[PDB]
Every structure is written in structure tokens, then in C-alpha cells.
């Protein structure tokens, strides 16, 4: 079978962006050594090494939705895969407001509105699941107490 | 944060209260009263549980 591939965006502190960028452009499989990426089973932590130095690393949320776009003539394009996490290096927290160009910065404040919002539907199945295994349930709406 | 309004605990501004009736290992009655302090997970079970009065 075929399985969609995952790009994520990997985003690294300027001098070790650079120090990765030259040695990306370079070519050599020294690269290979000389990055790694460790994800931890948290799921949203990492480390990734640069030149065997550890750097911390969370995995975040995109506010807006990127694909890759490759092409062969640069007039027709063809999607590749949909990416909407980056990994920065230096839950509310695993959340990304800004997006990574430049004109989208607070996109989640300002130009989208927080629809995303109605975590709540699992409480209500706990709160079903706790329900079914008692005897008796007693409810009343309430006010100010 | 981008100033917004906010809304009121629902436009009743009541929460929701359950009590809850168990029985522990051996022999025991212990009787648990959770009160929801989120509207939005508040009215779900709400629309839940009138869904389930209805199915009768």
C-alpha cells in the first residue's frame, strides 16, 4: 500500500539555522551526523541536535493550513502534503498563534475568529460513563451559591 | 488577548450540579455531588440527557 507522507516544519535558533543551512546546501552526508531529531513519547517534546549539541524542542499546532506544492515546469503544481506542525527549538501551550509568513502574525487573534472552540465533548462522555455505573442521579440548573 | 465580548456562564447564568450514588467494595453508599463550572461541557450533557429522556 501507499502511506501519505508527514512534512512537518522544522524551525531551529539562527546560528544553528545557519550552521544547518550550510551544511543542507553543502550536500555531504556529514549532514547526517551532525543532525538528529529525538521525539519523545510525550509526543509534543524533542530534542534535536545540532552538531551534537541539544537544543528543546516543542511540537506545535499551525494556525492556518500549508500544503506542498511541487512542480516539474513551474506552471502546473502538484500537491504533495498538507503541513500543520512545526517543530520549534530554542494543549494552550502546544498552540501556535502566528503563522509563518510574515503578514500572518497573531492570525489566530485577528484574522480568524476562535470557532475552533465547541475536550468538552470527552467530559460530557466521562460524565455519561460515571452516571451509568451509579444508582441514583439527582440534577437541578443552579444559581449564584 | 483581541478584546472580545464575553459571554455570561449561558444566557440563564445558572451552572450544573449532579449528584451521584455508588456503592464501594464490601458494603458501603457513598453518594458524590459534582458541580459543572464549564457552560459549554454543561450543555452538552444537558442535550445528552434530554436525548435520552426522549429515546424512551
Known amino acids: 500500500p501507499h502511506e501519505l507522507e508527514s512534512q512537518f516544519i522544522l524551525r531551529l535558533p539562527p546560528e544553528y539555522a545557519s550552521t544547518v543551512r550550510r551544511a543542507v546546501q553543502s550536500g555531504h552526508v556529514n549532514l547526517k551526523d551532525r543532525l538528529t531529531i529525538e521525539l519523545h513519547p510525550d509526543g509534543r517534546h524533542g530534542i534535536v541536535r545540532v552538531?551534537?549539541?541539544?537544543?528543546?524542542?516543542?511540537?506545535?499546532?499551525?494556525?492556518?493550513?500549508?500544503?506542498?506544492?511541487?512542480?516539474?515546469?513551474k506552471k502546473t503544481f502538484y500537491k504533495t502534503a498538507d503541513i500543520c506542525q512545526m517543530l520549534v527549538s530554542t494543549e494552550?501551550?502546544?498552540?501556535?498563534?502566528?503563522?509563518?509568513?510574515?503578514?500572518?502574525?497573531?492570525?489566530?487573534?485577528?484574522?480568524?475568529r476562535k470557532t475552533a472552540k465547541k475536550d468538552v465533548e470527552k467530559e460530557?462522555?466521562?460524565l455519561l460513563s460515571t452516571d451509568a455505573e451509579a444508582v441514583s442521579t439527582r440534577w437541578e440548573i443552579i444559581a449564584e451559591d | 488577548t483581541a478584546s472580545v465580548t464575553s459571554l455570561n456562564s449561558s444566557a440563564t447564568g445558572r451552572c450544573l450540579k449532579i449528584y451521584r450514588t455508588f456503592r464501594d467494595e464490601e458494603g458501603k453508599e457513598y453518594v458524590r455531588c459534582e458541580t459543572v463550572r464549564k457552560p459549554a461541557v454543561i450543555d452538552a450533557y444537558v442535550r445528552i440527557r434530554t436525548t435520552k429522556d426522549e429515546e424512551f
Do not use: Q, Y
Open chain 1, 51 to 73: 552538531d551534537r549539541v541539544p537544543l528543546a524542542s516543542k511540537l506545535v499546532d499551525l494556525p492556518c493550513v500549508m500544503e506542498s506544492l511541487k512542480t516539474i515546469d
Open chain 1, 92 to 112: 494552550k501551550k502546544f498552540i501556535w498563534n502566528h503563522g509563518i509568513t510574515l503578514p500572518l502574525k497573531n492570525v489566530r487573534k485577528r484574522r480568524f
Open chain 1, 124 to 126: 460530557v462522555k466521562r
